[PDB]
Amino acid sequence: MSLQHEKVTIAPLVLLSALDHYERTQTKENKRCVGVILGDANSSTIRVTNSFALPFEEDEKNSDVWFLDHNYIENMNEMCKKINAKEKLIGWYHSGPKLRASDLKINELFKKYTQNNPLLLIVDVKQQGVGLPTDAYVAIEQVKDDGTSTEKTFLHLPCTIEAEEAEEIGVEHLLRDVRDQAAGGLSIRLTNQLKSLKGLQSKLKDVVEYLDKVINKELPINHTILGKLQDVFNLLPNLGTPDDDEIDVENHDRINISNNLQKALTVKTNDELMVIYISNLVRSIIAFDD
Amino acid sequence: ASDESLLRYGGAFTIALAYAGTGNNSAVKRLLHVAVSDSNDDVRRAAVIALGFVLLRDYTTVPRIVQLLSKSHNAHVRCGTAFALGIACAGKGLQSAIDVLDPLTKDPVDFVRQAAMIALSMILIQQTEKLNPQV
Amino acid sequence: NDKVRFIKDELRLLQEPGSYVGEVIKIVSDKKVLVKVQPEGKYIVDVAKDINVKDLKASQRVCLRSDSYMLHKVLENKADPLVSLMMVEKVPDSTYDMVGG
Amino acid sequence: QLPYLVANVVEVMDMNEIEDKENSESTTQGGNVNLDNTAVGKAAVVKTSSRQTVFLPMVGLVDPDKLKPNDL
Amino acid sequence: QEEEKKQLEEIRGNPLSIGTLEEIIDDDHAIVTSPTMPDYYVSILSFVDKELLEPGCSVLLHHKTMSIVGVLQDDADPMVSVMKMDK
Amino acid sequence: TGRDDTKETVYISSIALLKMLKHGRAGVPMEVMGLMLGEFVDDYTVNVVDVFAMPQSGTGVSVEAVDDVFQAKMMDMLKQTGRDQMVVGWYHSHPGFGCWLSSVDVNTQKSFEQLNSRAVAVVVDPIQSVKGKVVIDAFRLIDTGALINNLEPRQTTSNTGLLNKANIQALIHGLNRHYYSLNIDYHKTAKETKMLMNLHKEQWQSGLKMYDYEEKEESNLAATKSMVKIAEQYSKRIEEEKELTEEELKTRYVGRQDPKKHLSETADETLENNIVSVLTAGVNSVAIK
Amino acid sequence: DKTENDIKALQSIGQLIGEVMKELSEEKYIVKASSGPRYIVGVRNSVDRSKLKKGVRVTLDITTLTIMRILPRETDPLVYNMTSFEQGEITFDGIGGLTEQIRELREVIELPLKNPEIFQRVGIKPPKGVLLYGPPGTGKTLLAKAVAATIGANFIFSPASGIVDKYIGESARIIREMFAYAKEHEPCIIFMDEVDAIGGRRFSEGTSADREIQRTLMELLTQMDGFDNLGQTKIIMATNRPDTLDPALLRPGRLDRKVEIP
Amino acid sequence: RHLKRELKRAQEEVKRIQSVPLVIGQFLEPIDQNTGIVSSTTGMSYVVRILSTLDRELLKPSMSVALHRHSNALVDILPPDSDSSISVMGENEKPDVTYADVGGLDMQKQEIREAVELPLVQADLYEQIGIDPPRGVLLYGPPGTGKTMLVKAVANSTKAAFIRVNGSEFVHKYLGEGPRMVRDVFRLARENAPSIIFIDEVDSIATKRFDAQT
Amino acid sequence: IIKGKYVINLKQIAKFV
Amino acid sequence: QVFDERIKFANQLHDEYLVSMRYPEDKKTQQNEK
Amino acid sequence: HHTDCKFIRVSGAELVQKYIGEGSRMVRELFVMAREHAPSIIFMDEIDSIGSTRVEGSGGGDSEVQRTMLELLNQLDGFETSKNIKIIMATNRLDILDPAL
Lengths: 290, 135, 101, 72, 87, 289, 262, 214, 17, 34, 101
Ligand SMILES: Nc1ncnc2c1ncn2[C@@H]1O[C@H](COP(=O)(O)OP(=O)(O)OP(=O)(O)O)[C@@H](O)[C@H]1O
Ligand SMILES: Nc1ncnc2c1ncn2[C@@H]1O[C@H](COP(=O)(O)OP(=O)(O)OP(=O)(O)O)[C@@H](O)[C@H]1O
Ligand SMILES: [Mg+2]
Ligand SMILES: [Mg+2]
Hints:
This is part of a larger assembly, with 11 protein chains of 10 kinds. Helices cover about 45% and strands about 20% of the residues of chain A. Chain A has 7 helices and 10 strands. In chain A, the strands form 2 sheets. Chain A has an 8-stranded mixed beta sheet. In chain A, a hairpin with a 4-residue loop joins strand 2 (about 35-40) and strand 3 (about 45-55). The longest helix of chain A is centred in the last third of the chain and has 48 residues, at about 240-290. Chain A starts with 6 loop residues before the first strand and ends with a helix. Chain B is an all-alpha fold. Chain B has helices at about 5-20, 25-35, 40-55, 60-70, 75-90, 95-100, 110-125. In chain B, helix 1 (about 5-20) runs parallel beside helix 3 (about 40-55). Helix content of chain D is about 0%, strand content about 20%. Chain D is mainly beta. Chain D starts with 7 loop residues before the first strand and ends in a 15-residue tail after the last strand. A 3-stranded antiparallel beta sheet of chain D has the order 1-2-3, with no helix packed on it. The interface of F and G includes residues 26, 27, 56, 126 and 130 of F. Strand 3 of chain G pairs antiparallel with strand 1 (about 20-30) of chain H, so a sheet runs across the interface. One adenosine-5'-triphosphate (ATP) binds next to helix 6 of chain G. Chain F: This is Ubiquitin carboxyl-terminal hydrolase RPN11. Chain F: GO terms for molecular function: cysteine-type deubiquitinase activity; metal ion binding; metal-dependent deubiquitinase activity; metallopeptidase activity; proteasome binding. Chain F: Keywords: Acetylation, Hydrolase, Metal-binding, Metalloprotease, Protease, Proteasome, Thiol protease, Ubl conjugation pathway, Zinc. Chain F: Component of the lid subcomplex of the 19S proteasome regulatory particle complex (also named PA700 complex). The 26S proteasome consists of a 20S proteasome core and two 19S regulatory subunits. Interacts directly with RPN8 and STS1.
């Protein structure tokens, strides 16, 4: 098993396919579609190219009770080679809104067939998230230095996408939106600028109330989270630094370029002002002549 | 509100008939905005045709309003323009109405040609050549 | 509107299926033309509406549209064989002032 | 089975056997742990009678000992 | 003229792809080598008179599967220009 | 009356489209193929819900390279997952050539037409789908006899369609002598839209994230210099621009590309670029501390 | 598994080799493919820009035309027959009586090879170039097999006329690429063997063949002397009569010592 | 505002056509501002559309140019720097010869600074005198003399750009390989003006007899 | 002739089984 | 502050270009000269 | 310049030829290019130093081609009415021409 990971890259196909398979098992209300996840690994970047359904039953009475049809998984993999002989198990997807604690026991079963720690890719079917509608975890077993026993736990990794160029234009072809969450002109990136700041608000809210929850409702004092929080402050500026004074000098510089650029545009349009007057001036004569 | 093009395509005409023959700015505003702003070609085409129906009564204002739309070189927009002028000036013809159709018989796209030819004959139904030299 | 909608018309122009440059060796008055295609072989092939065999003639470069090598238009520039001789040689003209004396 | 081009082998050059955490390639790539990033195994460049050359990860049924650097 | 040319153009192009007649075979076929470098073992439609064409003739091959559509008599070389008169 | 055949439009679900592209490009230039699972409802809608790939061969497409043994196993895999419906045809990918059926492909198609008459063949060009257009066209065999009787007009009855011919050359030969091509529409849901449009996790990380300010100074330097050269060129032009005939001025005093226009494009890009960048600096500096 | 390995290779596709001809921007490169024509291509992130230099072999994709990886230098199929020539090897003294010529040969070849440094004191241009000529049957070549074996340095070797092609300047490229290979290789001995028709003069009242001679000859002159001057790769030239050769192949300062073996 | 966002999508469309892959041709001559003739380096001539607001000042002279690989159209241009035969050797590398390691040929030493050294420092010297500057320099002689060496001496000495090509780097290998590489070396020199071109030998290129039989 | 396929040279120069 | 003022002056000059330029254009469509 | 002729400088060369590639078939076609681009001057300047055995061969191999030119010329005053294509020949001395010229 690879115990080295960094990122998860996801093909667009994977997400869409799990939503299709979800409605065709007709799953909802704690019955959640679970299929196998196919792709490349032994790589720090988990590259997920495809996904398929397995025959799976989820009991809603107990989620620690589940059905997985193990025999099917071997047969399906032989047909995966027929398509392309470089797709293997690298985990399993969940279709639910969020992480279950029965998902740790499920993850055990796919270890048997993987040369990499098994991936949990939550494909939402309500399409939440302010980035991608996918969350990503990989199960890691580690000692915890907080005085608590060895856990197997799902630790978060970033989500990214790797899309084939051939496929990507199909996304553009399908999509008739002119894009307001991706770069464009000034106004488009002006939305992108406000959108990012409003994203920071939402993310900043959740930390504050997690900290409240720890010392009154008694959620674990998790040192690893709070350590990254200490580094947020140390990497945070302080007023009266000559670096943040240099920002003032650097503001002057780019604004002045805008100031001259603005003048340049004003000149050019005043050439067209005079042109049109010369066009009206000739067309007085033509009218008068008729 | 429907994300379905076919439901929006009928929506244009639902305005056309609710507000038929009264020149209401609200009815007309929704149609003009959908027409320019949408990416589903059926819906846009429908919306312009709706304009002629709302403004049956004030048929004089129509060529000034819909000259804007014919200018756009999108095929379906142009096609919907043609019928709306057809509809508005059918009973009484206007010179300006006819002109906006004339470079639409010289557009190479044939869907635009079909509409424009029908529209012109809709305006000029039993009009003679000593009554309109363009006949 | 004019600025944005010529671009849409121009995509067709950019997504042409190829051309070629040919030169007309001769016509044949069957309403077809013998074209020695410049990189390629010889093909006798159909004319368009734009041109006709009495407006087509020997030693006139043509444009071909690679849908079947359909003769499209005349090409404004054509080769002159005399310029091959004189250019590759390279020889200016003089007046009688450079013989003076 | 037929048909299939017949070519000559430019060379056998060979990228390292895939058991590494860091690619499998003689010519090492950027990024930390690779195996099937753009790391592929044993390599043969063949030159064709279609007048080009191609770098492939070649079949492992046939050895780099059953490949000479001028074999048909 | 009108009904004869209907079925003349059926088996004619678009490209008419000149060949060089290497050798005839007497079964209504020949081996041509084209100026574009692939050989063809061509048929012969059999209205152009099967044996009226001989090595060194220039042949009209069809845009699809090659049949001798027809045969050109005369192909002006600059080498018989020297002999032939111009005045 | 007999049976009348009429227009259809092949609606390629968003899922189906990505799979054909993925499988087809990856296997190019070797021919790729696979079956289309879907359903026919209506009489104007072929709805392809999913595709899969059948194993590649170095004999490419063949009637016996279809392989029903593999089809049967695959069908049972969908059956156990509750996804089987009806195989609505086959697709195959020509490598870098156009969409047209090969002679061999006609006979591959003739087999599926027996099994279901509404079966299509969908010819894909993957090396041409890296434009801003994806090139895919669809065919469906029509009876040779029907074509003799002039029953190609029959296939366009009861709408004006979006009729257009995207490709000729081999295509229009095969249409004439075999098939009726179909236009292609795409189906997708409102869920699937959101999945497709989303392509970054850095959506909210792109107006707080910034580029190095040395790179910005280099950029302002580059931009201002470029427009300085274009201005000298413009100045040479606008010493006249006052004689009769615009076209004469454009040749003589170069208005080849119009240095007015050229300066406008360049001005506007760097001007817009700087307003975002200053705005990013000022947001972070004030808000964070 | 031996057949499982065959599936994973078969489902992969090939790649097309180029070399980096020229940087255009930083994410776009001009390559000259080995299929021939130059293209403009992009890059995978796995290749670093500063490992992309000009004359470095790259993969491209054959359906996307994008560099995935840097590839080792390409090398001729022909020069792999040439390192498989050293057979016919013999001892240090393997031509009797022409022993005096072996000693004279090693002065030029082996004494600067081990130490170029004894010539620094002396101050001369490093000894490069040898011509051997005699009446056939005196082991000009037998000596070459001895000085390949004894030194144990990288050795090549050339067939007579099997490095003459059917393409003019393709028969130049090959011999160009064995010199490059020989400069990457430590202390390489380069034997040109029985050059008598591949070293002719200007002629060209002959056939078109003599312009193949002439194209291929010009390549030698630039290599010997230009911004390549050899100090560790050595040239030995064997000929059967030394007035078959053009006088830029009889020019010392490309051929410092012209040794006769009688 | 819609027309403005519709501009961004149109320009976007055109950018996909611009982006790689591409093939490299050479621009011959215009016949319009939206039409030109291009020769590909696949050794074929095409009459091709000229994309909007691409150069038409530089484009009209012979110059490298970007063409689409599938569509075959003039979709981008390539500067007169890029698509080199080989880079400059007079501002990157420097020759291994100066005139402190030249001995004799003092008679030719007076002649080489007239031709090489005086037009680099100021080409205007000839013009203000009203004498034409010589064109090309032929160095000739029996092999060994130091002709080649002398080029290196004055190229290291003047310290302006140099180009090391030879006739075996214009040589044919593919179709349209050969004519193109000739054109490429002059366009490089002009951009990085001034510059010195050395083609080491023309004894293979120009031959007093051509068979012209093949 | 390979004893039991053949190696042909096309007139395209391209060699095949 | 100083740069802020200059920009607004430039923008107002655009506005004055807009009201003036297109106003006589309209009149030529209105009058007969075809 | 004054006659309005194309000044075609010929030098007995095969470099200007790259579509016939021998001067013994490039007389008739050379002539016919001059007739098209009439009026014209063929400046056949024989130097008689081309090659290195072709001036002990026949006293100039250029003079061999010149004899072809001049032999045509024996009927050129009547074919379509009146020489336009003057063959202006030139040589270093008139005594180093064979007496058949
Ligand atoms: N000097 C010699 N002593 C022993 N054997 C010799 C000698 N010369 C030649 N032979 C025998 O003849 C064989 C072939 O001769 P070889 O090719 O070495 O001669 P060469 O002098 O280089 O001739 P050429 O000038 O024609 O190439 C040797 O491999 C060897 O068996
Ligand atoms: N006249 C000279 N004085 C001093 N060194 C010289 C002289 N001529 C040539 N050399 C030396 O000879 C070597 C190679 O000279 P190079 O090949 O550059 O030119 P070349 O003599 O014109 O040769 P060729 O005409 O034979 O091709 C150099 O090391 C150079 O210094
Ligand atoms: Mg020997
Ligand atoms: Mg030299």
